[PDB]
């Protein structure tokens, strides 16, 4: 009884504070897993813009969250009405008679009559998912937008160990999430050696060359470029666009026309994964700053992973040795580890760049 009330309250608060991730992921699903339609493109663009604005400053994102949610729900309602009223024989005939909009443009923008196509399940998704986003938004508004704003305004042994593990994991994240996001972005962009991401390699190299310092502005520009490249791929997959002999312009430039019917998420999976990784990096930064401010911990504590443990106390037990590793192992053996990286790279290359790296 009392425990049931405890779970009710705790999970209600947790849902109210975590439902932003749920709405973001469901909007990503409805804006990447259906089709390259112009309203879908603007859904995805608004989602990426929201994530970028969050990455800019949590203060501004929190201040403008309410207006963003109203704009999102209003526009998704409007597009739902437009799509529903278009899905008709008579009304579509009236639209093609008066609006004088060509069939290919009218399909590319998104308003295409599936009754002529006959694919009913696609229409069921085309309705459910947008009104799914609508009900999710209205369930965010007037329900948790208050409690979430209040939260962001500034088995007992099992519970204690759970809290400790969460704290240590989030410290590990606040210290190595930049490395993790750089790793995933570079793995993707190595899987795609096209010409369209050359600014992204240049800007990622600039970010890694001088990270931490000068805030995370370079992360902002690279997230913006990821949004721009994903938008460009969306436009190219959309039908309005018109278009040494082994490779042609688009596939060398990476902005190629995929097979029709393929889901846009498939050939932009890595792009959205990198976007989510950048957002996760930003929210880790913001939440760790919030927790350290609530506990009165300055930015100096962010350098260490185990602040209560000093590297001179590693020899008392093996757990202290593991903590010393995780904390300052690189700080002590950076030269050795970087020569390890040099050797592995040379073993992976055997070439002229390997020769200069060998020098």
Curated annotation (Swiss-Prot):
Transmembrane segments: 15-35, 38-58, 65-85, 121-141, 180-200, 222-242, 265-285, 324-344, 346-359
Extracellular side: 59-64, 243-264, 345
Domain of life: Eukaryota
Cellular localisation: Cell membrane
Organ and tissue specificity: Expressed in the pharyngeal-intestinal and spermathecal-uterine valves and in multiple reproductive tissues including the germline, somatic oviduct, and spermatheca. During reproduction, it is expressed in sheath cells, sperm, both spermathecal valves and the spermathecal bag cells.
Signal peptide segment: none
Cytoplasmic side: 36-37, 86-120, 201-221, 286-323
Glycosylation site list: 163, 246
Result of knocking out the encoding gene: Reduced brood size due to defects in ovulation with incomplete constriction of the sheath cells impairing oocyte transit, an accumulation of ooplasm in the uterus as a result of 'crushed' oocytes, caused by incomplete opening of the spermathecal-uterine valve, which in wild-type allows the fertilized oocyte to be expelled into the uterus, and sperm navigation defects.
Role of this protein: Pore-forming subunit of a mechanosensitive non-specific cation channel. Generates currents characterized by a linear current-voltage relationship. Plays a role in reproduction by positively regulating inter-tissue signaling to promote oocyte maturation, ovulation and fertilization, and sperm navigation from and to the spermatheca. May play a role in regulating cytosolic and endoplasmic reticulum calcium ion release.
Family note: Belongs to the PIEZO (TC 1.A.75) family.
Other notes: Piezo comes from the Greek 'piesi' meaning pressure.
Name of the featured protein: Piezo-type mechanosensitive ion channel component 1
Organism, scientific name: Caenorhabditis elegans
Gene: pezo-1
């Amino acid at each position: 009884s009392r425990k049931f009330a405890a779970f009710v309250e705790y999970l209600s608060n947790k849902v109210s504070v975590y439902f932003i991730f749920v709405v973001s992921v469901v909007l990503l699903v409805v804006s990447t897993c259906f089709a390259p339609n112009f309203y879908n493109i603007l859904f995805f663009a608004l989602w990426a813009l929201n994530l970028i604005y969050l990455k800019f400053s949590f203060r501004l994102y929190r201040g403008l969250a309410y207006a963003f949610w109203l704009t999102l729900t209003f526009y998704t309602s409007i597009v739902i009405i437009a799509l529903y009223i278009y899905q008709f024989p008579g009304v579509s005939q009236w639209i093609i008679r008066n609006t004088s909009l060509s069939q290919e443009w009218l399909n590319a923008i998104g308003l295409v009559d599936f009754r002529a196509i006959g694919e009913s399940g696609a229409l069921f998704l085309q309705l459910l998912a947008p009104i799914a986003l609508f009900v999710v938004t209205m369930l965010q508004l007037k329900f948790f937008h208050g409690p979430w704003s209040r939260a962001t305004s500034p088995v007992k042994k099992l519970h204690k160990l759970a809290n400790q593990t969460i704290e240590l994991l989030w410290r590990f994240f606040e210290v190595h999430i930049s490395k993790i996001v750089f790793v995933i972005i570079a793995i993707f962009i190595a899987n795609n050696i096209n010409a369209l991401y050359i600014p992204l390699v240049i800007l990622l190299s600039l970010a890694i060359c001088l990270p931490s310092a000068a805030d995370g502005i370079f992360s902002l520009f690279m997230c913006a470029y990821l949004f721009l490249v994903a938008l460009s791929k969306m436009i190219y997959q959309l039908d309005i666009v018109p278009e040494h002999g082994n490779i042609s312009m688009p596939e060398w430039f990476g902005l190629k026309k995929e097979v029709e019917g393929t889901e846009p998420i498939y050939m932009l999976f890595g792009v959205i994964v990198s976007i989510i990784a950048l957002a996760f990096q930003s929210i880790v930064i913001y939440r760790q700053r919030h927790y350290r401010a609530s506990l009165g911990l300055p930015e100096s504590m962010r350098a260490k992973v185990f602040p209560d443990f000093h590297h001179s106390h590693f020899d008392r037990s093996l757990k202290n040795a593991i903590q010393f590793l995780i904390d300052y192992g690189f700080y002590k053996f950076g030269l050795e580890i970087t020569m390890i990286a040099i050797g592995i790279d040379i073993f992976n290359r055997m070439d002229a760049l390997a020769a200069i790296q060998c020098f």
